[PDB]
Enzyme design. Structure first.
Site: not given
Ligand SMILES: CCCCCCCCCCCCCCCCCC(=O)OC[C@H](COP(=O)([O-])OCC(O)COP(=O)([O-])OC[C@@H](COC(=O)CCCCCCCCCCCCCCCCC)OC(=O)CCCCCCCCCCCCCCCCC)OC(=O)CCCCCCCCCCCCCCCCC
Ligand SMILES: CCCCCCCCCCCCCCCCCC(=O)OC[C@H](COP(=O)([O-])OCC(O)COP(=O)([O-])OC[C@@H](COC(=O)CCCCCCCCCCCCCCCCC)OC(=O)CCCCCCCCCCCCCCCCC)OC(=O)CCCCCCCCCCCCCCCCC
Ligand SMILES: CCCCCCCCCCCCCCCCCC(=O)OC[C@H](COP(=O)([O-])OCC(O)COP(=O)([O-])OC[C@@H](COC(=O)CCCCCCCCCCCCCCCCC)OC(=O)CCCCCCCCCCCCCCCCC)OC(=O)CCCCCCCCCCCCCCCCC
Ligand SMILES: CCCCCCCCCCCCCCCCCC(=O)OC[C@H](COP(=O)([O-])OCC[N+](C)(C)C)OC(=O)CCCCCCCCCCCCCCCCC
Ligand SMILES: CCCCCCCCCCCCCCCCCC(=O)OC[C@H](COP(=O)([O-])OCC[N+](C)(C)C)OC(=O)CCCCCCCCCCCCCCCCC
Ligand SMILES: CCCCCCCCCCCCCCCCCC(=O)OC[C@H](COP(=O)([O-])OCC[N+](C)(C)C)OC(=O)CCCCCCCCCCCCCCCCC
Ligand SMILES: CCCCCCCCCCCCCCCCCC(=O)OC[C@H](COP(=O)([O-])OCC[N+](C)(C)C)OC(=O)CCCCCCCCCCCCCCCCC
Ligand SMILES: CCCCCCCCCCCCCCCCCC(=O)OC[C@H](COP(=O)([O-])OCC[N+](C)(C)C)OC(=O)CCCCCCCCCCCCCCCCC
Ligand SMILES: CCCCCCCCCCCCCCCCCC(=O)OC[C@H](COP(=O)([O-])OCC[N+](C)(C)C)OC(=O)CCCCCCCCCCCCCCCCC
Lengths: 168, 450, 230, 173, 50, 98, 118, 72
Positions: F53-54
């Site tokens: 997850v950026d």
């Protein structure tokens, strides 16, 4: 933005039959009239044709479906209040739809459908914005439908199958 | 039901105080206290005006009896009062104070600022205050002291102008509103403006009919939206409401009936009140252009708010939180007892609608029938407005058609107008074409070919 | 998950059947008064007279499309088609055709044609013009390419449903981003621009005329890939 | 399903003061121990101040002025004034009493006890030589009623004249 | 009419906010309260005059 | 009915919602995202960066989590969250009505 | 018989005491149809009926004989109050009305709407 | 629908979720005595009630009941 680009497909030599209605198995509306079961099913479909015409509900009762894997095209024989018509569909344009989606596509309350209209097996052509409805009393070719070109592993597209038709 | 000005003032203060308590029901929150204090300040201003008017009346006539004042005011009409540096007409000053207090309590333009904030009260309290209890105090005052205002130049100039301005303002704001309680509050403001304009026309029977219709159907709609809000977990904005027709079946149909009656629409019990208001509207005013234009705009504004409320609440796409629908869609809940509302609530709403229909029909028979059977109103001012209800002329009959067709076009707009892309855009245009052509042919056959 | 069966007095699907009018469920049984049952039972409809009437007097199968590939008749002996509109074009044609029946009929039938016109004028200027009429004026019914002229023939619906074709040079065609026109014609795109594609707008620089293409319109792969248009 | 813990004390959060309560803001804050609030809420804060609020209000209300003008013009070029006023059968009454009071001038009669006091000797006194207020409305109503009566009389005269002309034409044949 | 400014959210919220009448009245009421009830009455009145 | 005897607040378990269900729903929501590749690798002790997850994808996932769980999460709390464990703990212990 | 529209069947004029007894609303007392109204009210009192029956009965059932006189008087009263008998004539033919002026007072100011240019 | 129930201190005389077992008898003994009190008030006030004449009645101007002006 999906655009209806046509590819100019053609039929192949030897098709493979996939669907064959047990009723209407004969050839011709005259044969349907002379056959007892065909006549009563035609009368029961008369409201279906009425919905086709006056309610602007694009749908077709499909019988005697064949498949051409060389060009990947389905040839459908459809029964209308006037007779049997031949139509061609590209597999790229065919997606499944729920029965409730088929019902809700039309904004007019459809007449009470007959009991031989297969609700589970209703498909949708996106190119024509049309529905295909099969008959419950029918025979399916298992070997034909198990063809590699008909596999979901090749014909599956999440965006097209789940997000193309949003009736709301 | 006050016999003298002292009892009237007592009841005035009591409704003010009890409305304050109802608004401030959520005593723990200080945000509610701000709205309660706003309403309290406006109510105290109205109390000041009413007290000063009563003092003037007592100083002039040594009596506080309502009947005696009504039957004596004409003698003192010619009198004047010597104030600081001006000689003000006695009737004008008394009527000025009465109209000021009436406007404050009826939420007319300028003094209506408290009504939108009073919606912090629970829905039953809001319905009771906004239907016929708190917002009709000014109408009651005008009706009870009508002999005074009939001889009031200030009343003649102020009632129609403020009434029409309030009607237009409330109607348009309600149409553009997005919250259910706020929409109903602004609709109440608009209908109070219409009531003021009806009193200006001067047919007390029409005023009473308008009051009854508005009160009954406003209360019913308030109850329906209260059920909707309770289901939606205290979220009163319909931007988070969608597809509630199935979850609240009774509310949908009850709201449909109540709204079509409330918003004056053709072929409904609530069309006649606006029809009679336009029948009685006077034309000798100097600001008649503005008055009439504001009245027309306010009258048409009903359609938009009714449509928006009903459609957005019930038949729009599901916009609410997933929990609202999932918590109620569980199969375990499927039962003969299943419901998202109360059976007692449904029965109460049904009986209210039935009794309102019956009472409105009784009043219509009493007043609008050929045989006039209403009791004496104790007023000697005859407006001649009934002439255009009994024997209307071609001019007026065709004039009413303008508003009728305006409403028709607005209905067509709110129905067939597309604001978002849909699979049914082309078929919707086709349906519009079919409807237009079929309407033309049906009219042709009905009028000429039979 | 369902526990209705545990109680003898609990509601049943037989009790819920009455909701099938307001609720969509697949058919379970046919009532005696259904259209299907009536037609299949009454022997009158089995008569060859009624059967032949059904077969003839209704929409024909000839006009029914039979394939996903369409090759409409060429506009010019040397031209080739590229784009064609299927449903919105017909809808616009039928809508504009009303001006040939409703309008003269309104004049000859309404007691107050001036009143009708006075009502229609503001109706046209608000919520109707931008809604349908301007979109129809800019709508492209059909598009073909003439290679010898290096031009494109565009067919359009006019007043009263009249169809007229016009030529535009390929060198004078430009792409107009929707951002440059959204603010100028917000109302048009707000209430009437849904049918046509927003991001595929073109215009003729010389004549300053726009071209709107239907979203549900058929394009030709060969026509798009022709070198003239690339 | 889940056994929820008892309602949290966190639902009401204690408010800790971090700024001096200026005496210049006395009673300008709705004081509270959980959720203190300013006495006045400004939801339309996108408008910096009331003056810009007035500017925006008038600029946007220009549209409603245009709508009102168009509606009034449409009704003006498509309608005619109606016949409205007091009933001609009730002139003796509301209209009659209004002028009757000024004719009687009963408010300035001599005192019954013989005291030198009379009307015009109080803060609230009668003015029977006054021609302002509702006088204009009453005069307009009376004039309108007279005009309607005149119209009815003229219609009666017209019908009588038509009857006489028809009778004479019949006789002269 | 192809360009309509009344459908834009600016006009929409203007009308929804009751024409900003409540906002304007509340601002003026705040001015009156601050000037009359504090600066003029309490400080100038109680602290200076009294 | 409450007994006449004095009864005190009973904080049964800090969780106001079934933490297991909360965790499973949050993991399903995370797996729905395009950047997330292997739903199996996701555990309560897995950090957002390692599960894929950026920072920008995190705010989208958290907005959809707010929609799913019927609550609003403050930016401070969202920035304080460092693992799916912390996220599910905060969501489960949150009183949905504040 | 052969009485004017204001007179009733019995050609009897009720006094102030009789009006007070059969108390008449001021709305009706202001007009000229008190003589025709009082018999109708007396008939209704003698034969009370529900409001639904009053609305749904087009001839007023039992009280039809008196309602005929009352309805005629009401028509004349309202027509003379609103001057509709002249306004309708002017609407039907303004040009002919001006040619043989029915009422110059109304004719000089009458102006039919431009929309109603039949 | 409603808010979750939370404990209320026993010592505090408050109405939060108060339900009385004997509410039936409490209502019985609070309704009827109130009805009797209102009946007494009503019969006391009826002595000073005024009503206009009936349908078939007229007020004789010379009867004592008719209003009388002050005689100086
Ligand atoms: C000798 C024999 C002679 C026979 C003559 C027959 C003549 C037939 C004439 C038909 C005329 C057209 C009717 C159209 C109806 C539908 C209209 C409509 O929906 O359009 C709006 C439609 C949109 O509406 P929608 O809701 O979306 O439509 C959904 C469906 O239509 C689905 O619609 P829906 O189901 O939601 O509702 C539609 C409904 C509409 O129906 C109504 O609204 C009528 C309601 C009843 C009125 C009754 C009046 C008379 C009686 C008064 C009361 C008497 C009381 C007596 C004392 C009683 C004491 C107890 O349709 C009907 O009219 C049904 C017929 C009525 C049957 C019941 C009548 C009462 C019987 C006695 C009582 C018992 C009842 C049953 C038991 C009840 C429980 C105990 O707009 C369109 O787009 C229309 C497009 C065009 C569609 C046309 C389809 C039909 C085409 C037919 C072509 C011609 C065929 C010729 C064949 C000839 C063979 C020989
Ligand atoms: C006996 C004869 C007596 C005659 C007396 C005549 C008295 C005349 C008084 C004139 C007073 C003018 C006052 C101007 C104040 C300007 C304040 C200012 O600087 O604001 C900055 C502000 C712009 O600054 P900003 O920071 O950009 O604003 C931000 C906004 O959000 C930005 O807003 P936005 O962009 O979202 O939308 C705003 C939009 C708002 O929408 C509109 O403005 C369009 C609708 C305007 C309707 C105007 C009222 C309609 C008529 C009502 C009449 C009522 C009284 C009479 C009733 C008679 C009944 C029988 O406005 C526009 O943007 C369009 C600009 C053009 C507007 C039209 C300008 C017309 C000027 C007058 C021309 C007169 C030519 C006469 C030629 C004669 C040849 C023979 O201004 C505006 O926003 C626009 C204000 C527009 C006010 C127009 C008022 C016109 C009144 C005409 C009355 C004619 C009476 C004729 C009687 C004849 C009797 C025989
Ligand atoms: C969430 C939903 C939200 C709500 C959605 C609502 C949807 C509907 C929206 C529209 C509804 C109406 C809204 C109110 C109007 C808004 C107007 C507006 O914003 O325009 C701003 C726009 C300027 O800003 P912009 O950025 O260009 O706006 C973009 C355009 O809108 C872009 O325009 P375009 O390039 O696409 O082309 C369209 C063009 C063209 O569009 C049209 O023309 C539309 C059709 C107009 C029909 C009007 C019929 C009126 C009813 C009676 C007549 C019926 C016909 C009877 C038969 C024929 C006559 C006998 O539009 C216009 O030019 C403006 C429309 C006309 C506004 C007129 C406003 C009233 C003017 C004063 C009253 C006039 C009536 C009589 C008064 C009598 C005394 C009280 O234009 C204006 O300036 C507005 C008018 C300003 C008037 C100033 C004062 C008068 C000027 C001096 C006149 C001197 C006369 C001297 C005579 C001397 C004789 C001796
Ligand atoms: C102050 C001044 C005021 C002026 C106000 C003016 C108001 C009057 C306006 C008149 C408009 C006239 C419109 C003409 C329409 C034709 C235009 C045209 O060329 O279109 C060709 C179009 C298109 O032609 P085409 O060549 O493209 O194709 C032929 C038709 N199709 C498409 C089907 C193949 O053709 C038509 O529409 C033919 C219409 C024929 C019928 C026209 C009259 C119908 C109404 C009759 C009267 C009303 C019903 C009476 C019923 C009685 C029953 C007993
Ligand atoms: C003279 C120049 C040309 C004028 C062309 C006519 C106007 C533009 C085309 C209008 C087509 C729509 C006609 C609908 C007729 C409906 C029946 C009718 O009332 O006709 C007689 C009436 C008029 O006949 P009339 O004049 O004998 O009626 C008596 C007069 N009134 C009614 C005023 C008391 O029709 C109308 O009033 C039409 C008004 C103009 C409508 C303009 C478009 C807005 C409506 C959009 C189309 C859909 C409307 C659907 C309405 C359904 C019913 C509410
Ligand atoms: C010029 C001729 C003389 C008349 C002058 C007046 C011209 C007409 C002025 C009409 C103003 C109507 C304002 C309605 C505002 C509704 C706001 C609302 O609730 O949201 C939008 C609601 C829809 O709400 P919604 O919730 O469904 O979606 C809203 C979507 N957004 C927010 C994106 C916009 O309703 C509408 O959209 C309909 C209003 C727009 C269409 C207006 C058409 C006007 C047609 C006029 C016909 C005139 C007939 C001739 C006679 C007239 C005079 C007698
Ligand atoms: C030349 C110009 C002269 C201008 C004179 C203007 C005088 C009146 C100014 C208005 C305020 C007057 C003082 C009362 C303040 C009440 C504050 C309050 O209750 O807050 C609640 C509210 C604040 O609540 P809110 O509305 O911000 O938020 C609560 C609502 N919710 C919860 C939804 C957020 O106050 C107001 O909004 C303002 C109330 C205005 C109405 C005041 C009624 C009394 C009027 C007395 C007039 C006295 C005149 C004396 C002579 C003057 C001579 C110049
Ligand atoms: C457990 C008991 C619970 C309570 C049950 C109560 C049932 C009430 C049912 C009817 C209510 C709705 C009536 C219709 C709406 C109003 C109509 C209207 O305006 O009136 C027009 C009509 C008036 O008459 P009209 O309109 O037909 O015309 C009369 C004609 N003239 C004038 C010539 C005489 O009124 C009604 O129809 C209403 C019914 C008559 C009034 C009944 C009042 C006495 C009630 C006796 C029962 C008491 C029960 C006590 C229970 C105590 C429990 C603790
Ligand atoms: C001789 C004839 C009859 C004689 C009777 C005379 C009656 C005189 C007036 C009595 C008032 C009694 C008030 C009791 C309040 C009890 C506490 C409560 O309600 O909860 C407070 C609530 C919550 O209380 P709580 O739940 O925390 O505590 C309840 C138990 N105690 C108080 C004992 C601890 O708090 C508030 O928010 C304050 C609300 C006050 C509401 C007051 C409304 C009064 C309305 C009366 C209307 C009467 C109309 C008159 C019309 C005719 C006029 C002429």
């Amino acid at each position: 933005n999906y655009y209806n680009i046509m590819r100019q497909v053609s039929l192949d030599s030897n098709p493979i039959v996939l669907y064959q209605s047990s009723t209407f198995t004969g050839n011709g509306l005259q044969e349907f009239y002379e056959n007892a079961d065909a006549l009563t099913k035609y009368l029961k479909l008369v409201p279906f044709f009425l919905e086709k015409n006056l309610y602007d509900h694009p749908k077709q009762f499909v019988i005697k479906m064949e498949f051409h894997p060389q060009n990947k095209v389905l040839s459908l024989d459809c029964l209308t209040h006037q007779g049997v018509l031949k139509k061609t569909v590209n597999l790229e344009n065919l997606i499944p739809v729920p029965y409730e989606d088929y019902v809700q596509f039309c904004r007019r309350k459809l007449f009470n459908a007959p009991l031989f209209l297969d609700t589970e097996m209703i498909y949708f052509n996106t190119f024509q914005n049309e529905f295909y409805v099969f008959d419950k009393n029918a025979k399916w070719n298992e070997e034909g439908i198990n063809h590699p070109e008909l596999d979901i592993s090749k014909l599956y597209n999440e965006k097209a199958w789940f997000d193309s038709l949003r009736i709301i | 039901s006050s016999g003298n000005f002292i009892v009237l003032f007592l009841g005035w203060e009591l409704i003010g105080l009890t409305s304050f308590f109802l608004i401030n029901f959520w005593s723990t929150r200080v945000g509610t206290l701000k709205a309660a204090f706003k309403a309290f300040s406006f109510n105290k201003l109205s109390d000041l005006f009413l007290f000063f008017a009563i003092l003037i009346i007592f100083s002039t006539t040594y009596n506080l009896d309502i009947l005696s004042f009504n039957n004596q005011i004409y003698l003192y009409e010619s009198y004047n009062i010597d104030m600081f540096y001006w000689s003000i007409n006695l009737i004008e000053i008394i009527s000025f104070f009465f109209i000021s207090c009436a406007f404050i309590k009826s939420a007319q333009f300028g003094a209506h600022i408290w009504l939108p904030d009073s919606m912090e009260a629970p829905v039953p309290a809001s319905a009771l205050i906004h239907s016929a209890t708190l917002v009709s105090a000014g109408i009651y005052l005008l009706l009870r002291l009508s002999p005074l205002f009939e001889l009031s130049k200030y009343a003649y100039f102020i009632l129609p102008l403020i009434g029409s301005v309030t009607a237009f303002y409330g109607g348009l704001v309600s149409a553009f509103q997005s919250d259910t309680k706020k929409t109903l509050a602004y609709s109440t403001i608009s209908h109070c403006g219409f009531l003021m304009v009806s009193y200006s026309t001067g047919v007390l029977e029409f005023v009473i009919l308008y009051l009854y219709v508005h009160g009954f159907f406003k209360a019913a709609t308030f109850l329906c939206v209260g059920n909707v809000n309770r289901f939606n977990r205290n979220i009163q904005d319909f931007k988070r409401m969608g597809g509630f027709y199935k979850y609240l079946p009774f509310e949908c149909l009850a709201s449909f009936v109540c709204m079509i009656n409330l918003s004056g629409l053709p072929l409904t019990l609530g069309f006649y009140i606006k029809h009679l208001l336009f029948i009685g509207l006077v034309e000798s005013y100097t600001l008649y252009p503005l008055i009439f234009s504001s009245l027309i705009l306010g009258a048409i504004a009903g359609v938009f708010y009714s449509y928006r409320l009903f459609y957005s609440i019930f038949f729009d796409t599901k916009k609410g939180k997933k929990a609202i629908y999932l918590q109620a869609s569980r199969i375990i809940l499927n039962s003969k007892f299943y419901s998202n509302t109360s059976l007692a609530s449904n029965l109460s709403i049904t009986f209210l609608v039935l009794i309102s229909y019956t009472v409105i029909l009784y009043l219509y028979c009493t007043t609008l029938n050929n045989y006039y059977s209403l009791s004496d109103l104790k007023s000697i001012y005859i407006n001649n407005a009934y002439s255009y209800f009994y024997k209307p002329d071609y001019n007026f009959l065709n004039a009413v058609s303008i508003l009728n067709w305006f409403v028709i076009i607005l209905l067509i707009s709110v129905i067939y107008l597309n604001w978002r892309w849909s699979y049914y855009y082309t078929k919707s245009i086709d349906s519009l074409s079919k409807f237009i052509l079929f309407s033309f042919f049906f009219f042709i056959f009905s009028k000429y070919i039979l | 998950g369902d526990i209705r069966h545990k109680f003898s007095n609990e509601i049943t699907d037989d009790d819920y059947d009455y909701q099938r009018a307001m609720h969509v469920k697949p058919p379970k049984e046919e009532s005696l008064f259904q259209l299907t049952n009536i037609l299949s039972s009454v022997p009158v409809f089995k008569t060859r007279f009624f059967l032949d009437f059904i077969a003839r007097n209704l929409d024909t199968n000839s006009a029914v499309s039979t394939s996903d590939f369409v090759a409409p008749p060429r506009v010019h002996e040397n031209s080739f088609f590229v784009y064609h509109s299927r449903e919105l074009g017909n809808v616009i044609r039928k809508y504009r055709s009303l001006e040939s029946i409703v309008l003269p009929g309104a004049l000859l039938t309404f007691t107050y044609p001036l009143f009708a016109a006075f009502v229609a004028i503001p109706s046209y200027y608000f919520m109707f013009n931008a809604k349908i009429y301007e979109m129809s004026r800019r709508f492209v019914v059909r598009m073909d390419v003439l290679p010898h002229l290096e031009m494109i023939s565009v067919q359009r619906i006019g007043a009263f449903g009249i169809l007229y074709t016009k030529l535009h040079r390929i060198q004078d065609l430009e792409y107009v981003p929707f951002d440059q026109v959204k603010e100028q014609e917000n109302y048009l795109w707000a209430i009437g621009g849904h049918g046509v594609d927003n991001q595929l707008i073109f215009k003729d620089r010389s004549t300053g005329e726009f071209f709107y293409f239907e979203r549900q319109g058929v394009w030709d792969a060969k026509g798009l890939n022709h070198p003239l248009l690339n | 399903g889940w056994d929820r813990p008892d309602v949290p004390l966190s639902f009401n959060p204690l408010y800790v003061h971090k700024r001096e309560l200026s005496i210049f803001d006395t009673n300008m804050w709705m004081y509270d121990q959980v959720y203190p609030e300013y006495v006045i809420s400004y939801n339309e804060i996108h408008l910096v101040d009331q003056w810009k609020g007035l500017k925006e209000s008038f600029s946007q209300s220009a549209y409603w002025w245009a709508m009102m003008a168009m509606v009034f013009g449409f009704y003006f070029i498509n309608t005619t004034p109606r016949q409205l006023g007091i009933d001609t059968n009730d002139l003796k009454g509301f209209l009659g009493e209004y002028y009757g009071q000024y004719k009687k001038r009963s408010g300035i009669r001599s005192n019954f006890l013989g005291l030198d006091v009379t009307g015009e000797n109080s803060i609230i006194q009668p003015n029977y030589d006054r021609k302002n207020g509702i006088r204009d409305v009453i005069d307009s109503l009376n004039a309108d009623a007279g005009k309607r009566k005149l119209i009815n009389l003229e219609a009666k005269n017209f019908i009588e004249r038509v009857e006489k002309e028809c009778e004479q034409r019949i006789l002269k044949k | 009419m192809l360009k309509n400014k009344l459908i834009k959210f600016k006009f929409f919220r203007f009308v929804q906010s009751g024409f900003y009448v409540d906002f304007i009245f509340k601002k003026f009421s705040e001015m009156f309260i601050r000037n009359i009830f504090i600066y003029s009455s309490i400080f100038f009145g109680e602290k200076f005059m009294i | 009915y409450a007994p006449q005897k004095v009864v005190l607040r009973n904080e049964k378990s800090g969780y106001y919602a079934n933490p297991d269900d909360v965790a499973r729903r949050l993991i399903r929501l995370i797996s729905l995202h395009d950047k997330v590749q292997n739903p199996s690798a996701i555990t309560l002790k897995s950090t957002w960066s390692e599960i894929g997850v950026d920072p920008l994808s995190y705010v989208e996932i958290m907005l959809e989590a707010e929609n799913e769980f019927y609550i609003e999460l403050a930016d401070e709390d969202l920035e304080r969250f460092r693992t799916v464990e912390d996220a599910v703990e905060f969501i489960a212990r949150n009183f949905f009505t504040n | 018989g052969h009485g004017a529209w204001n007179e009733n069947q019995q050609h009897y004029k009720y006094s102030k005491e009789e009006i007070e007894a059969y108390q008449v609303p001021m709305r009706i007392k202001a007009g000229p149809c008190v003589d025709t109204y009082i018999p109708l009210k007396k008939c209704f009192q003698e034969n009370p009926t529900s409001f639904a029956a009053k609305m749904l009965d087009g001839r007023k059932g039992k009280c039809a004989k008196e309602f005929k006189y009352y309805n005629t008087c009401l028509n004349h009263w309202q027509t003379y109050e609103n001057n509709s008998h002249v306004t309708n004539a002017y609407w039907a033919d303004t040009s002919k009305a001006n040619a043989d002026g029915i009422s110059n007072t109304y004719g000089g100011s009458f102006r039919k709407g431009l929309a109603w240019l039949n | 629908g409603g808010f979750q129930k939370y404990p209320i201190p026993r010592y505090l005389h408050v109405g939060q979720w108060i339900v009385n077992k004997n509410w039936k008898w409490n209502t019985f003994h609070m309704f009827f005595p109130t009805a009797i009190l209102c009946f007494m008030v009503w019969r006391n006030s009826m002595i000073s009630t005024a009503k206009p004449p009936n349908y078939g009645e007229y007020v004789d101007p010379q009867s004592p009941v008719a209003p009388k002006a002050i005689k100086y």
